[model samples]
Target: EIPPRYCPLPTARHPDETVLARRTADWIDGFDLELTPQQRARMRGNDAPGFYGRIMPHSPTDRLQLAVDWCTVMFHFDDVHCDEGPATGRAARFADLATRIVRVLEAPDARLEGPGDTMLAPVRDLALRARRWATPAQMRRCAEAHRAWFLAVAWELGHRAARSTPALNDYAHMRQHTAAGAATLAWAEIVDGAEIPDRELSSPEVRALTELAFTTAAFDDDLFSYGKELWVARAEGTAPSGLGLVEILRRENRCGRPEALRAAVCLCNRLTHRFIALRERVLPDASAPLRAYLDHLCHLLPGNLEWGLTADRYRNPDGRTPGAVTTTASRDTDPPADTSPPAIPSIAWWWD
Candidate 1:
């Protein structure tokens, strides 16, 4: 019998592969999950850690993973399997597989059920923690939060091996808008609630700020949920353009003037910290496996972002990557018996 295709563990030295994959494996192993050699092999090949099917490493020559690999995946899958091509009416199969996987694995917590548990709370907290929150209305925030959370769910669903071509492609596309939707909702809420006086709010600069804020807010939610692959799709002027959180700030703050950069950095930190705090409180145990998962997952965040900044500057490597996002392990640590509230309010009010 033909043996299954060779799958290299991140630890295994394969024949003449580049160093980047080796470094990535080392980085993934650092998570302390204790994957067996067999598991590692799976992660490196067909059954890689991410739900996105496979993660194609991008070189300096091709920095965008989606620009090449996904483009190929999409074109081939569509051309060969499409109805006109050869496989008509296969979208349902993909949809079925995608949805089932999402239903089972979207929640990072073994204890929680779905995106309602993993993503919903964070999105809501994004709105709640705004310095001027009530102006946006909790109801509005909740709606958008659910929308972003659902898109996250769909993206995960779409990536499963069981997922078929059309379903995978559809969710992949839909998620881009969802990420932007989260940011747009947040920006609208923030600008409406901004401390600026009404007279100034009417000025062109204020209008510009509001517009820029909408676009920039798009990136974090986008990146956190879908990674650069969908972000490229979002960037093609299809979902939203020039709304990357980084670019928006660059425009607003004059492209890295120290003060603007500093303030922007501070805001991102505040939002991130607030997000973690929100997660800690919302879960049932509020500790235990959840905390353990958060700690492990947080470690994964920085690498996911592809930025080397401290957790203080960047939350964690896996904060936004697909593999890290897809796992459903609980925290090893438990919550405090009688958890005292953090110094700040659980839900920060925006209007106050």
Candidate 2:
């Protein structure tokens, strides 16, 4: 319906995807999520296994499943608690759920409320299984990432509640976190048994590269899912609202949907190009695990694009193909633009 999408990432599927997908389906079946048939269809349609399988293609079968397992849990929770359920716009309600849920993810064995809620059970399963693969430090980091996701989501929900859209720079910074991108990055290290040094993994350079890739994916998601978001809003008799990436862009540029979408595409490409350049400088001194993490980060940009293009989660929400993909757009259509940091003051420091 708009300009061709623009992504320059390559496509490389894991050889084991066929096998891994079946295993993931089976694992999900084991969860007592009490999903309705429609909910089940939507959850399975996310193709969590395929998503991670494409990105972390080299990880061991069992290890890679952990990523799939957690990803599945993440999407299900997002659908039920954040997107549709009674708690959708209420930050306090989601805050209560997320607070308890993160505690369960961190301490699965205590005499705590584990698996009490339908969503909690699946996450508890992933959390319990993760202990076998993730180290103490990695586990702490993973838990912290989830915590960040919860806060960012609450922030987004806060915006949605006020019926307020943030400025473009603010939305750009928030998208990376609201997508829970940090947790996925942690998966890169854990799924591969990577042991990046604390200094390297925590350095400003590596952190900037991580957010750069993350924001790129977030923008790509907004582009692909824009139609679905609009459909969902109308379907529910809700306004064409929320503090979404596109709305913020429209507000920023004072333009229509088409211009906002193209700007989103341009912004995505810009960050991706920056990641490529920044990564080269980091690689010269990166640890082996850091190198592997960067490589997986590279895999994520394309992997995310390839999966979003085909995933039913975006295309067929509510069992209808509302936002179906029609054509593809490549970076070749990209116009000449400055490569400097975006004018967003929050993220401009990324260039330094």
Candidate 3:
């Protein structure tokens, strides 16, 4: 086992952060979204201050607010619906909701199945803003990514219901969608107003780079949320015991806590390196929009880490109080170096 360690990535924050944070809070308040007081409190308390803001740190104020709104809506949906309650196991219901949501993204003016009385007010409002800001192709990508996310959630629910733990390979495949990586990056492109041509986006190298970015981001998430997720699993008594990458590595490798964490870190570093290499490979030929998109993807690595380390969501796992477990952002600023190449054949090919 590689010992658990913290390695830093470069970091940046959106300017006028206090103003942006307040703006985001105000936009959220103005929405007619149907979350309860506790749910709204969770959103405010666990706000991802730097996550989207830092990705496109110089985005126009209105666009920045839109990006933050997207994050808020998606996070609430994940927490309130997919992660808990009857919907976690109700694949059919989830499927229906997913389909409706995709339709909203694809056709902003299309009537919802239930007229104006849908439970998707948050989704509807966001889609309206997305339609105004994003191009048709960009909107399509977002819709597709979101549809993929819902299907992935259903897959996770299936595994949960069966009391099953997927193999590492299977878990990676499911996580590509479940992590919301595609949609998150798509939103990044939207915020940056970058719409790479289909010809460029569909190239094998670019496609592979996109996969690397998605995989890297998702794996980062597995580590960042490990502690908090474990807290939930224990508190909620979810069957089949532990969850997330740390637990999977511990069980699969038959190792202890520190060893499992080390393995997870090793995987993330390998993916990050692949992302950097592959990004450089494709950049020279990339158009301006494509380049901007790739740059946003790059920022996500460090942006997510800095935000996760300090965000109240992770710090206060119980979600009962804000900033209960605050830690210095500098703690993970320097991670021990690991020059070793990934050994797993499937993942090792990324470097090749």
Residue pairs clashing, model 3: 6-335, 7-335
For each candidate, the alpha-carbon lDDT, in order, equals 0.31, 0.77, 0.70
**Clash count of each predicted structure:** 25, 0, 2
Relative to the true structure, candidate 3 reaches a TM of 0.87
* Native-to-model Cα distance after best TM-score fit, residue 245 in candidate 2, in Å: 2.0
Models ranked on lDDT: 2, 3, 1
Instruction: Rate residue 236 of model 2 by lDDT.
Output: 79
lDDT of 2 by residue, 1-352 (tens): 4354444556577777767667876777787776677866786789887788778877787788888877777787887788445644476668878887777778885434544566666677778887887788888888899898989998888777677888787787888999999887787677877567888877999889988888888887776677777877878798666567777888878898888877777677678778888998999988888889888888888888878777887778776565453434454456326688778888887788
Number of the predicted model whose lDDT against the real structure is largest: 2
Candidate 1 to truth, TM: 0.27
The superposed Cα distance between candidate 1 and the true structure at residue 119, in angstroms, equals 23
TM-score of each: 0.27, 0.92, 0.87
Candidate 1, position 102, lDDT: 29
Q: Candidate 3: misplaced stretches above 4 Å?
A: 1-9, 87-89, 113-119, 237-243, 321-349
Q: Is candidate 1 or candidate 2 better by TM-score?
A: 2
lDDT of 3 by residue, 273-332 (tens): 667777878889889999998877777777877677767777676568555444332233
Candidate 1 residue lDDT tens string, 214-301 = 2223323333323333344444544322323333344554655334334434443443343344444434442342333233223223
